[PDB]
């Protein structure tokens, strides 16, 4: 694996230098062992030393054998020890350089981190995901760039899984390697020792060259054995060894110069610190990490092998890349088969789908042409890719605290759709300035707490142009409603304020609007009904509940209005009903629930078209004979009021489909109510009935679904209601 | 490969030193063969002091050949013993140290352990399961499982070994022994390496001279090689001594995963005490990461998760919902019949009031039952019973009924008395006298709340736990074997008993402790050895009997004491071979349902015409001739079941009732059928089983109208 | 192209363009 981490001036030159150094050691060694003769010969003209101060010949008269002895003595007991062991010296130095350059290689405490690093290196130029990743007023409303750049391509569960595995591995391997700096320390130590040995070697070997000589004056003490005292002696190899020493010294200098470069490099710039600054300078990916340890160091070393590596690695190790990967992987798995698992519907169905557990917006959801409603919950980076064009209808979109980043170029589609839009928000500005750009939005639901200032800025710029707004629901404190509401208010059909922090005067709004065909004040801290509410001639519905409203005495002037048709007064403190309610007959709904009503005058009977009445959780203990006049009564609750046994007027009606009786006193339901034949359900609970009537057989719609009873015995009818079930 | 089991401060160094030491042997060997000459030469000085000192030449008139002899002799029987064989001493010991180092490799009973050990570690190291286990696509299950089985068998095999450990110790010890010896010899014998030596061999008779002085030409190279050799060996020895220190100050015969266990997801790891432990220490020396990956893989907790994931990936919420059905008292009946465990997805079925489990080992029902809302009924049959979930409150709020079936005795869990909210229990199983007494006490004794109890078993004797618990008993049933009819002190204790059922029990005679139970209001006696109805005379004096089923018995005779009863809503005279019916049944004008079948009647009495409320009338397989006109003298007759009798035709008048919802005509040999029958609004091929159209006018009309 | 030579050639084209840009 060394090849892919091969260092330009650390491994390349060192290996060739080392080979040459070894070669010269071997050459010299071979010669030193067998070609070194050291030819000595005696001399007669000895004056002081050197046998000088001087044809037939000399005739020294010595034995050929004894000359070899002299040679051996002069060789052993004289100078030039450097020359004698020069190739061994070279071999040692060569081996030192070779060994010191390769401690990390094949040594487990360092090779482990290199193996993890190299494994990554071999994946950066593989796993095609990498090369896909390498392919690269406003008012936060423009993102067509990313729409076309992604090319809506896929990974086919191959690049997806490969890249995912590599993300797990790059994060884990980095966490492992990043713990320390052993790889770093070894290279700094190695670089320094190479320089140290270099300096010492040159000093040592350039000095001992004066030792290599043509000849030597041999003055060893052997004349008592061999006759002559002084010998002159030649060393033929000495010429060659001066040459070899010179070549070795030059070779070491070259090595040294390169080693100084590498030591120079590792000191001039920090190597542990490392980041892909060059990538964020050139590439679209600014998401560049920086760590200071062995991982970064090893990346830095290979940065000088090939910049291409850095480009591949840098784009891979990114959260931008991972997020694009995840969205693509989402599409790979979250297909039509998975979307179908959640295609539910609740009421006014419109074929819903709610995506809650997704980390982003799938593209496959827009293949669900059949749906009209899409619910997005807690999903970040919602752009709504402009591939919603294959949908036909889109009647409702829920931005349930997701993201304000809706910038895809598909307003034309949305402007032909989205009758309704729901925005849930906990922050102030995650509400996009996108809403007003929609023109066909009729219904808008805004839920979250904004200050008066925030209401004014968000509503004026984000909503004011919704000329077709007909329905507006504000689940906000609304200490003041911005003038936008009153202006849309003249075309607005429904306005609903539903919050505990509601404390304000709405008289101006009511007067300006003068329409409000549906009005809701829920949990608003109200005690007083604003009197201008009676200018809403087309009010047609009013829901006053969960208020501090303790009176109905104020509803005197309701006849100023026409077609009221509905009055909801539940969960309030109206413990008493006056005789103004009897003048309200153009009413088709009335609800008095948990208001602690002690008494109701016979006034409800005047509203002979009431048909629907809720009398519950009131300390009333009474049923008037209004019930005998309202012969179109279809639904009535008489519960939690401790009423005595029901009076016979109970059944003097025609339908009373919903007969809800409970938490009262009823030893027995008047059996005659069973002859209405239109009972669909009878609730008989908490009343201590002794027995059940056996006249219910007359009614075909009291099969065992509507028999909400405690006893379910004392009868002959159980098999009839069971078979009908 | 072998690399990953090499010792970091042992093997790389051993190999490099061995290589260098061999190099020294090679150099010195070659040197010794061609360069050792021993140039020796005679002397004339005082030999008493090796030719001491007390220009032309000395001449020494010896021939050259003769000098070769002198050199050879001086070499052969004089000094330099050590130097002469120095490279061979080097070679021999170097080879010994090298051979010792590699002794454990390629050894008859170590290689097999090592090969399997390495393969397993590599598979554990690179398995995606190990990664998931750190916290399957239906294939990682199989892969991890195969590895787990191989690991368990491997571990079991290695568990009995002590070879790798011991051979390594013997090897370490012999290297240390040889180390000490080689230093002692090599260091001591260096005084024999000299350049100048004195040769005094007795060769005067051949050379004249006795004393020769001599120069060993390689004295210096052998001193150098020896010194360099000694240093190599000392270094080698430091590692050898280190090895013993490491091997003796650490047990190494045992390995614990404590340093990993407190960092990872598992807790269930045993203390390894064998060759496996030793091998584990060695990889821990190379790289601890392999110890970790192995440990993470090998865990029962991990196996449990692996298997659980396999269940969850198959028995998905769609898979479970698709197979979710309903048959009676619906409550979303989901049946899991062949699972290896229970998937977690079953607990996301919040609406799943009924869960039926069978043939599932180790059921535990982890407490995630809180996710559910309704769990009104649970059927545990022929499964396992290891549910010890600390969540009785959830269970108590639900489980109104439990249906639990057994094949042995001890299989029965005691999760019954702990749920005092239980209303209905069904038990089937292998019983005996004492086995049942002990279990029924532990099971039901505290359930005062229990109202419904049914037992399918070879009981043979009624227990008193049931009679005592039974004081709150609404419904009681027992079947498939006769029991001592302990009624004298059982029915009286129970006393509510508003629904009693006895099936396939050895009853020949009816007990009379039921005669005073006015609150009975329902009684079913069937498939008994009962052949009569003689006892039922005063029985019917009780008001509100409302139901009497005496079917599937041998009661071929009906008395006229049957007229004593006026309150009956069900009467079954089925398969008793009765030969006659008295006109004493009508007394119960609320009867509405009367089964007259598989008898030997051949005729019918004028009783039908007295029951205007008869709705369901079955007259089958009784060989009855043309039905009497009383047949249609009623107001309802919704179900007219006729078959295996003799009827030429139905009287047209029965079709004029118009309240007929079904007429069965099978096996009655009808020649024809009247048209009035097709006028009835609810006989439009509504269950009108006929053999033929029987020459009617509107069979295709009623077929289209439906 | 059998719907695969498209991908193969395209990948080569992208690699060639990046290679050429670098060189």
Numbering used by the authors:
A (entry chain F): 15 to 68, 94 to 175, 214 to 802
B (entry chain A): 15 to 68, 94 to 174, 232 to 802
C (entry chain E): 232 to 254
Which of the paper's sentences describe this entry?
To produce homomeric SWELL1, human SWELL1-FLAG was recombinantly expressed in LRRC8(B,C,D,E)-/- HEK293-F suspension cells, then solubilized in 1% decyl maltose neopentyl glycol (DMNG) detergent, followed by purification and exchange into 0.05% digitonin for structure determination by cryo-EM. Image analysis and reconstruction yielded a ~4 Å resolution map that was used to build a molecular model of SWELL1. The ECDs, TMs, and ILDs all share the same 6-fold symmetric arrangement; however, in the cytosol, LRR domains dimerize in a parallel fashion with each LRR at either a 10 or −20° offset relative to the rest of its protomer, producing a 3-fold symmetric trimer of dimers. The nonequivalence between identical subunits arises from a hinge around the conserved residue L402 in a helix of the TM4-LRR linker. In the extracellular domain, 25 Å above the membrane, a ring of arginines (R103) at the N-terminal tip of the extracellular helix forms the narrowest constriction in the channel structure. Therefore, R103 is a critical residue within SWELL1 that impacts ion selectivity as well as pore block of heteromeric VRAC channels. Within the pore, constrictions are observed at pore-facing residues T44 and T48. Near the bottom of the pore cavity, a constriction at the intracellular face of the membrane corresponds to a short N-terminal coil (NTC) sitting parallel to the inner leaflet of the membrane. The first 14 residues of the N-terminus of the channel are not resolved in the cryo-EM density, presumably due to flexibility.
VRAC is a ubiquitously expressed mammalian anion channel implicated in diverse physiological processes including volume regulation, cell proliferation, release of excitatory amino acids, and apoptosis. Previous studies have shown that SWELL1 is required for VRAC activity, and that the presence of other LRRC8 subunits dictates functional characteristics of VRAC, including pore properties. SWELL1 is organized as a hexameric trimer of dimers with a four-layer domain architecture and an overall jellyfish-like shape. The transmembrane (TM) and extracellular domains (ECDs) surround the central pore axis, and share a previously unappreciated structural homology with the connexin and innexin gap junction channels.
